[PDB]
Design an enzyme around this catalytic site. Structure first.
Site, PDB file in Angstrom:
ATOM      1  N   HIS B  96      34.411  37.221  26.023  1.00 16.61           N
ATOM      2  CA  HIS B  96      35.489  36.990  26.976  1.00 16.61           C
ATOM      3  C   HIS B  96      36.889  36.758  26.409  1.00 16.61           C
ATOM      4  CE1 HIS B  96      35.458  35.635  31.492  1.00 16.61           C
ATOM      5  NE2 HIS B  96      36.148  36.742  31.284  1.00 16.61           N
ATOM      6  N   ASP B 119      32.616  32.814  36.271  1.00 13.36           N
ATOM      7  CA  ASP B 119      32.137  32.360  34.979  1.00 13.36           C
ATOM      8  C   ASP B 119      31.496  30.983  35.111  1.00 13.36           C
ATOM      9  OD1 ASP B 119      32.000  31.633  32.221  1.00 13.36           O
ATOM     10  OD2 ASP B 119      33.802  32.815  31.822  1.00 13.36           O
ATOM     11  N   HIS B 121      32.023  28.950  32.814  1.00 12.97           N
ATOM     12  CA  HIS B 121      33.061  28.197  32.099  1.00 12.97           C
ATOM     13  C   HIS B 121      34.479  28.551  32.550  1.00 12.97           C
ATOM     14  CE1 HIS B 121      29.538  29.378  29.738  1.00 12.97           C
ATOM     15  NE2 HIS B 121      29.462  28.085  29.479  1.00 12.97           N
ATOM     16  N   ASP B 123      37.041  28.637  30.351  1.00 14.17           N
ATOM     17  CA  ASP B 123      37.664  29.316  29.211  1.00 14.17           C
ATOM     18  C   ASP B 123      39.163  29.062  29.181  1.00 14.17           C
ATOM     19  OD1 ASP B 123      35.139  30.424  28.698  1.00 14.17           O
ATOM     20  OD2 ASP B 123      35.628  32.292  29.749  1.00 14.17           O
ATOM     21  N   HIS B 136      36.572  32.793  22.745  1.00  9.90           N
ATOM     22  CA  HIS B 136      36.165  33.281  24.059  1.00  9.90           C
ATOM     23  C   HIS B 136      36.203  32.124  25.064  1.00  9.90           C
ATOM     24  CE1 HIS B 136      31.584  32.133  24.015  1.00  9.90           C
ATOM     25  NE2 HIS B 136      32.343  31.168  23.525  1.00  9.90           N
ATOM     26  N   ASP B 227      32.342  37.280  33.824  1.00  5.02           N
ATOM     27  CA  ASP B 227      31.555  36.876  32.668  1.00  5.02           C
ATOM     28  C   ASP B 227      30.126  36.845  33.214  1.00  5.02           C
ATOM     29  OD1 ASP B 227      30.072  35.415  30.813  1.00  5.02           O
ATOM     30  OD2 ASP B 227      31.784  34.123  30.304  1.00  5.02           O
ATOM     31  N   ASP B 229      27.586  35.319  32.258  1.00  4.99           N
ATOM     32  CA  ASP B 229      26.900  34.039  32.228  1.00  4.99           C
ATOM     33  C   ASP B 229      27.306  33.208  33.436  1.00  4.99           C
ATOM     34  OD1 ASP B 229      28.966  32.693  29.532  1.00  4.99           O
ATOM     35  OD2 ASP B 229      29.338  32.678  31.696  1.00  4.99           O
ATOM     36  N   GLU B 272      30.544  39.354  28.131  1.00  4.38           N
ATOM     37  CA  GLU B 272      29.475  38.549  27.556  1.00  4.38           C
ATOM     38  C   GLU B 272      28.041  39.090  27.625  1.00  4.38           C
ATOM     39  OE1 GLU B 272      30.160  36.259  25.547  1.00  4.38           O
ATOM     40  OE2 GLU B 272      32.250  35.747  26.000  1.00  4.38           O
TER      41      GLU B 272
HETATM   42  N1  LIG Z   1      33.163  30.109  27.056  1.00  2.00           N
HETATM   43  C1  LIG Z   1      32.325  29.067  26.656  1.00  2.00           C
HETATM   44  N2  LIG Z   1      31.063  29.343  26.473  1.00  2.00           N
HETATM   45  N3  LIG Z   1      33.010  27.838  26.511  1.00  2.00           N
HETATM   46  C2  LIG Z   1      32.295  26.725  25.884  1.00  2.00           C
HETATM   47  C3  LIG Z   1      33.318  25.623  25.474  1.00  2.00           C
HETATM   48  N4  LIG Z   1      34.070  25.137  26.615  1.00  2.00           N
HETATM   49  C4  LIG Z   1      34.258  26.206  24.425  1.00  2.00           C
HETATM   50  O1  LIG Z   1      35.483  26.295  24.476  1.00  2.00           O
HETATM   51  O2  LIG Z   1      33.584  26.630  23.336  1.00  2.00           O
HETATM   52 CO   LIG Z   2      33.818  33.411  30.069  1.00  2.00          CO
HETATM   53 CO   LIG Z   3      31.058  31.965  30.488  1.00  2.00          CO
END
Ligand SMILES: N=C(N)NC[C@H](N)C(=O)O
Ligand SMILES: [Co+2]
Ligand SMILES: [Co+2]
Ligand SMILES: N=C(N)NC[C@H](N)C(=O)O
Ligand SMILES: N=C(N)NC[C@H](N)C(=O)O
Ligand SMILES: [Co+2]
Ligand SMILES: [Co+2]
Ligand SMILES: [Co+2]
Ligand SMILES: [Co+2]
Lengths: 314, 314, 314
Positions: B96, B119, B121, B123, B136, B227, B229, B272
């Site tokens: 991502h 998503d 998350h 991000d 990502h 995304d 996920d 992803e």
């Molecule tokens: N995009 C994800 N999987 N984020 C996880 C977590 N908030 C990070 O910045 O690594």
């Molecule tokens: Co993402």
């Molecule tokens: Co995600």
């Protein structure tokens, strides 16, 4: 409720064999007993003896037209008989092509019937619009009065008489509709709730709308044609044409629990259960078990519970 | 719709390798063909050749800053090109982090764009708030104008220019947000629908609110960064950072079916998808299959059905 | 929140052994630590030492009446102690029969408490209406004031004093209720949301109604008795009496996230986790993991995220 059970071990409406075993496995799951276990008066009319029609070449693209038209003709008579006996007909079947005989026979005794079709498909292809030639995907076309002029004379269906209008049917669960079928939906103005609508409104509003749409004007007998592939294949995998993103077990029971409460159910079809398509013995029982639960709910089994008209604490 | 396909085999935005294979598996699932199978005009711009940057030590905690910033810079140019061609850009990607280039390139041709981010998350970590150092998980921070002063000069992102306001983006599916990310959410007043809101309102009201919030004032191009996920891992297991309790397959298709109907989709990211993380060959196809279905819905494939502008019954 | 943890390794409320291991597996999943990882003040009161009562023949049909009545008596005292310490009692238990002591002990310090019972069952059978004789299916009958005259003097429960009215409890998740239990539901006018209601209204309206019903008149302490078999067995399979068609993981977290937000939770029970009933080591962790997630949400863990009272961007 008072039930009239009809076994319809038929499969010629589609390619896969195993569907004619539906009655067998469903009865062996203890369906009769479990129904009697409830406040149900059950009379088994047995499994229809569908004679073998060795000579049945395709009509254009349509496969086994004579075998299908005959099985439905027989089922229609047996269904009309059960209704004349003041019983709710319960058709344990093979493929959904039988819906033609089931709904036809029901309409002979109750011409004012309304239909609820739970399925991943609309099964409304005509012998001319279909691309598969499988009759379990065309039943609705034979029953609709509006399509009376677009249906060719297919060997085996001379006895058929369109018995319902596009306005007396509601679809629930659609997620795999052919272009020709969709054209018919939009053209005839048929009321439907595809998985898109279920997602948007919730199964609660979907049923409110469905019953309101069919019983708003006046109360009338209800015919529920339940194709097990209407539910997600994680619940009913042992079926011929499964499609992901289906109705949940809960939504399935909700639909039926609501139909029951109307007190207007007079016809029921539990179709497309094919034991031979389970990749494991557990997928088979999971499918049959789910199919039985759906059935039991149609006749009163409520998740919140049930109790006899007595004082349990005394 | 008219589509401009862009392959982005990139993985340096996170630790796991397999994501650069996303374009490969998605194309081999027959995505181009299936899109053409619909009323889609498809032009493949191929897979971006992301040169290898051997020398790319961490910037503080941020990993592979030069490789990520470069891949996004390249993707931004390719995306802007496709938009100038009057086509909807479809970025088949790796991680991502590419969203930085995708959204940047899109905004160059359509500065009035609104973003929908599906998503698990947000991000939205900055190079300074992140605890993982994986890019990502920081893309959104680089694009937001309000955070312009909190983002350090990270090697590889000199070309970046914040192109959207906290008010032009809506999150859907959140269920794993870092404390620093949540602080940003509440501080900038960003509109979001975490899994809590989806549960409370239903996916139907969530989309009504989302589109209403982004298109209420005026109609404007839409950029959907999806995304995989974001959906529950029972549907898309082959992905780097899965989180249970995700959006269902149905909710996934509902979101996209609704976006399509706006007729305003002009940018799409399917991110992803990591084939190497499937514990079985089936988890891989289940993920790819789901990712393709999501894509097809963005371009018109409807569960209730589709039909050509003709008389199918004639 | 300030928590008072109480381990209740008890199983005599039902046939299957493995439930007394609930505290063990839940603590070893890192529950204490993870709670402390949040803004929680945690004090462990250990696992109650339930003495063995070798002589405990059935009372009519009711099994192990002395062992159950004693364990609940002990738990009630320990629970009342924790409340006197100004802490929210968290009972990690074996079978749901312990609810009798948990709710009794809680009511001694907070007689104005309201109860939310998440379960696939109503557990409201009396020693006389029960058909199984298992006490984990009768706890509610011992606590209801209205049933004070229908409950026989069962060895081990002389200490019991009905502490709640049929109007101070709300059920959520019901899908397996005995006829006698349903009779009680309808007779005492108890408020419930079986899976039928959840399907009809959505978990969002169900919680609005639940809290509104219990906190409408005035704010009062809340006791949440969470039986893990309330959630669908695809999420919590390692449990004694699982029933398909249960609450989803999401709905489970939604319920608890909402309870937490009331700021009125003062009693919690996480029951029926039986590690020995997992068909695989993964079904065990899936059950424990889910049970921990539910717990964490009761104490603040939000899916949209959480952050400390500080400026993360600075
Ligand atoms: N995009 C994800 N999987 N984020 C996880 C977590 N908030 C990070 O910045 O690594
Ligand atoms: Co993402
Ligand atoms: Co995600
Ligand atoms: N009923 C099914 N599976 N229909 C499929 C397809 N619409 C047909 O007519 O073969
Ligand atoms: N709590 C359960 N599993 N109850 C089952 C049944 N209603 C009983 O009293 O044994
Ligand atoms: Co079907
Ligand atoms: Co069908
Ligand atoms: Co239970
Ligand atoms: Co219980």
């Amino acid at each position: 409720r008072t039930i009239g059970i009809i076994g319809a071990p038929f499969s010629k409406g589609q390619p896969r064999g195993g569907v004619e075993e539906g009655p067998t496995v469903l009865r062996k799951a203890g369906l009769l007993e479990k129904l009697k276990e409830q406040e149900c008066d059950v009379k088994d009319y047995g499994d229809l003896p569908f004679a073998d029609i060795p000579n049945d070449s395709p009509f254009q693209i349509v496969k086994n037209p004579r075998s299908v038209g005959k099985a439905s003709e027989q089922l229609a008579g047996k269904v009309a008989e059960v209704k004349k006996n003041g019983r709710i007909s319960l058709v344990l079947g093979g493929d959904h092509s039988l819906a033609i005989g089931s709904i036809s026979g029901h309409a002979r005794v109750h011409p004012d019937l309304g239909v609820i079709w739970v399925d991943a498909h609309t099964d409304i292809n005509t012998p001319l619009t279909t691309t598969s030639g499988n009759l379990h995907g065309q039943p609705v076309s034979f029953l609709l009065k509006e399509l009376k002029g677009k249906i060719p004379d297919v060997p085996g269906f001379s006895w058929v008489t369109p018995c319902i209008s596009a306005k007396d049917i509601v679809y629930i669960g659609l997620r795999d509709v052919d272009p020709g079928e969709h054209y018919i939906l939009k053209t005839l103005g048929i009321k439907y709730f595809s998985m898109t609508e279920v997602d948007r409104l919730g199964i609660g509003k979907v049923m409110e709308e469905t019953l309101s749409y069919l019983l708003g004007r006046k109360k009338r007998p209800i015919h529920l044609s339940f194709d097990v592939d209407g539910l997600d294949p994680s619940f009913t995998p042992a079926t011929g044409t499964p499609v992901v993103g289906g109705l949940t077990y809960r939504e399935g029971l909700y639909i039926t629990e609501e139909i029951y409460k109307t007190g207007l159910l007079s016809g029921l079809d539990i179709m497309e259960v094919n034991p031979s398509l389970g990749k494991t013995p557990e997928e088979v029982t999971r499918t049959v078990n789910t199919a039985v639960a759906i059935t039991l709910a149609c006749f009163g089994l409520a998740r919140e519970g049930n109790h006899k008209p007595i004082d349990y604490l005394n």
